[PDB]
Amino acid sequence: PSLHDALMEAIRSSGGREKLRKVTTNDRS
Amino acid sequence: TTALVCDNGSGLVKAGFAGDDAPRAVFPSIVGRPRSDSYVGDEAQSKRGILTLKYPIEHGIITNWDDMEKIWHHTFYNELRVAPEEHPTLLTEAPLNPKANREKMTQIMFETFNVPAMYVAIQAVLSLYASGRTTGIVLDSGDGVTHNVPIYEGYALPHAIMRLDLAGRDLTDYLMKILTERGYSFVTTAEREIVRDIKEKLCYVALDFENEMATAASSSSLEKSYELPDGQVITIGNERFRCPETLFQPSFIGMESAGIHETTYNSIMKCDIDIRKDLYANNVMSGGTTMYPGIADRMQKEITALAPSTMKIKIIAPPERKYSVWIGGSILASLSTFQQMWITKQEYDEAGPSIVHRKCF
Ligand SMILES: Nc1ncnc2c1ncn2[C@@H]1O[C@H](COP(=O)(O)OP(=O)(O)OP(=O)(O)O)[C@@H](O)[C@H]1O
Ligand SMILES: [Ca+2]
Ligand SMILES: [Ca+2]
Numbered sequence A: 001p002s003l004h005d006a007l008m009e010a011i012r013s014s015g016g017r018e019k020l021r022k023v024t025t026n027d028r029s
Numbered sequence B: 001t002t003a004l005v006c007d008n009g010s011g012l013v014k015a016g017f018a019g020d021d022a023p024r025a026v027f028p029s030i031v032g033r034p035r036s037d038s039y040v041g042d043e044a045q046s047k048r049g050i051l052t053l054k055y056p057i058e059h060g061i062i063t064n065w066d067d068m069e070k071i072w073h074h075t076f077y078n079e080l081r082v083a084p085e086e087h088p089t090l091l092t093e094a095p096l097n098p099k100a101n102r103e104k105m106t107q108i109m110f111e112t113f114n115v116p117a118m119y120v121a122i123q124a125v126l127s128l129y130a131s132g133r134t135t136g137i138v139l140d141s142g143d144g145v146t147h148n149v150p151i152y153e154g155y156a157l158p159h160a161i162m163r164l165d166l167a168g169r170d171l172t173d174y175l176m177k178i179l180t181e182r183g184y185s186f187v188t189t190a191e192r193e194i195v196r197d198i199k200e201k202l203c204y205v206a207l208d209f210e211n212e213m214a215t216a217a218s219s220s221s222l223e224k225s226y227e228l229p230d231g232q233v234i235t236i237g238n239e240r241f242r243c244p245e246t247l248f249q250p251s252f253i254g255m256e257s258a259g260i261h262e263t264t265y266n267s268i269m270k271c272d273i274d275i276r277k278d279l280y281a282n283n284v285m286s287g288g289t290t291m292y293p294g295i296a297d298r299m300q301k302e303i304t305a306l307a308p309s310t311m312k313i314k315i316i317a318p319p320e321r322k323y324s325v326w327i328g329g330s331i332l333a334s335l336s337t338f339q340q341m342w343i344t345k346q347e348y349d350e351a352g353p354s355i356v357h358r359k360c361f
Helices: A003-012 B065-079 B099-111 B123-130 B168-181 B189-202 B209-218 B239-245 B260-269 B273-280 B295-306 B321-332 B336-340 B345-351 B355-359
Strands: B004-008 B012-017 B025-028 B031-034 B051-054 B089-093 B117-122 B136-141 B146-152 B162-164 B224-227 B233-236 B283-286
Touching: A003 B336, B004 B065, B004 B321, B012 B065, B012 B321, B025 B065, B031 B065, B065 B099, B089 B099, B089 B123, B089 B321, B099 B117, B099 B345, B099 B355, B117 B123, B117 B321, B123 B136, B123 B146, B123 B283, B123 B321, B136 B260, B136 B273, B146 B260, B146 B273, B162 B260, B168 B189, B168 B239, B189 B224, B209 B239, B260 B273, B260 B295, B283 B295, B283 B321, B345 B355
Parallel strands: B004 B089, B089 B117, B136 B283
Antiparallel strands: B004 B012, B012 B025, B031 B051, B136 B146, B146 B162, B224 B233
């Protein structure tokens, strides 16, 4: 009933970092 | 139509694209000038010895806006190689970031970089999101500052936020000091970078300080060999755990503040009793300075000793947690439901920079 409520649910059910596209980091320390 | 995620820290910029699992670019949050006009980030450290380096973010708060503009310019153009006019940009802010700061971030994004949309999210809340949670207590410890942020359903609770003005830079400085007390010499900026690497590769948190000091005095079983860039080999000993012990006992560097186990307990106890059970069980650690081996077991021991005997205590420490804030922003900004949460340039034109308090909270 609240957009906020739906967002919080979308966060909980996002499968986290596994669902994200694997990329390489150009990492300086 | 790919949003950007820029996590600006006291020590490190983390930047990439929403939907990716890691930032594309991580570089020092510094601007150097002659002691060209200015050098930003990776190129400023590559001449670290011939320039005055400035940190535009101190203790997680932006304090030099001209150099910050230079950091943000360097991020968009040199690192991400994007035109900012084509990408919504999610930025991050420290807990309790001054109202006027949040407005100037917005004003610079829209008026200077002409972004189509943006947003300002709280670093610690994003780190909770990366762990799949929306209620919990985050311990966020970086290079300049350490916060405990208790969060209920995506809202940080500002009266219960604790601060500790000690983080990874202080620990590096402290490891430098106790290594020189052992006989070594770390004076140059190149040698300080070596100490930071020793800190990150060999330090750990002892489960009990005194037991570990006793093991280190009576045997060589906790010593490590470190090869220096030129091939020299030095041995690190009790320095490995004495350095991060400062997180639990800040008196080692002369600070009479409480350690991170006690700020964590004191923050839970500033919260309404009915949410403390959920906080105690959802203690998320984020930031580079929570990366020490042993820190979760030590935290578990210390909070157990402070909490009611029946309380379920759980320390969550994701292996990727030096990038947890960024990953959280990558998650949030690639969710379908979030797309009406952006501040749009059109919204900015009508309401002005103070739109940020209405839409980002
Ligand atoms: N494996 C490690 N062990 C211990 N410390 C580490 C490790 N990796 C990184 N650090 C430290 O973490 C710090 C950078 O962390 P982070 O990016 O979370 O902070 P920041 O956002 O730059 O600063 P802040 O959050 O304080 O504003 C540096 O001090 C770095 O030396
Ligand atoms: Ca940070
Ligand atoms: Ca003390």
